């Protein structure tokens, strides 16, 4: 294959700014944070 | 589908004079920061062998007389000097995306 970023456990196809695969990454690709879930809310809270 | 046009069709240089071979591409064969065009040489009655890979780097075992430079759509290969053990047919190959295509060949007289 051919990936812009490579990690010891595989490789990343994305443009997101975060990942939690491995810290020792090579290439220009998202940074590493040890979190399970990171979401940004872009809408109203819905009663339904 | 890059189509490779290589000129001159037949090159003739005596011993010791620079020999310039060139070929052009339809769109740019440069991606990811490095131009992906490889130079091949096929001696008569022999299988082709790699001379220049990625249009700049030279394979080990190939004498330093072979020089390749280029950028964008045009690439050139120069040989300094030229002796009797240089007659062959040279091809330039692109690998930006499949299918791979070859040049029309060039006899070196």
């Amino acid at each position: 294959c051919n990936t812009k970023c490579q990690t010891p456990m595989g490789a990343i196809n994305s443009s997101m700014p975060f990942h939690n695969i491995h810290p020792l990454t090579i290439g220009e690709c998202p940074k590493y944070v040890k979190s399970n879930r990171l979401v940004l809310a872009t809408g109203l809270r819905n009663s339904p | 589908d890059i189509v490779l046009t290589q000129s001159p069709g037949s090159l003739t240089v005596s011993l010791g004079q620079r020999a310039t071979i060139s070929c052009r591409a339809s769109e740019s064969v440069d991606n990811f920061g490095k131009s992906f065009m490889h130079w091949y040489q096929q001696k008569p009655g022999q299988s082709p062998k790699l001379l220049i890979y990625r249009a700049s780097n030279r394979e080990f075992g190939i004498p330093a007389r072979f020089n390749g430079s280029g950028s964008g759509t045009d690439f050139a290969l120069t040989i300094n000097p030229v002796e009797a053990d240089d007659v062959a047919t040279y091809f330039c190959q692109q690998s930006n995306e499949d299918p791979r295509t070859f040049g029309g060949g060039t006899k070196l007289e």
């Binding site: 490579q6 997101m16 990942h19 939690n20 979401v39 | -």
Partner: protein, 81 residues
């Protein structure tokens, strides 16, 4: 006759977190985290890496007779051992 004020509503069940309460549902949620990988190990920017199968830097540089496939190796992106 009547006129009132209102806001967009949706039937989506996207879950977002906040400090006051961990579970709140919103109409539109954007996730920024990559947890999936292809699982392979291929080249970076078109140049194949130097994949040392069994011998290591000491073995390859010294020329271990077990691995003679790593002599005259071309340009690489990274070394895998």
């Amino acid at each position: 006759d009547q006129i009132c004020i209102g806001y967009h509503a949706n039937n989506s069940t996207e879950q977002v977190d906040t400090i006051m309460e961990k579970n709140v549902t919103v109409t539109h949620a954007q996730d920024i985290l990559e947890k999936k990988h292809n699982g392979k190990l291929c080249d970076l920017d078109g140049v194949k890496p130097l994949i040392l199968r069994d011998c290591s830097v000491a073995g390859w540089l010294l020329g271990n007779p077990m691995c003679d496939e790593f002599i005259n190796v071309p340009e690489w992106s990274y070394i895998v051992e």
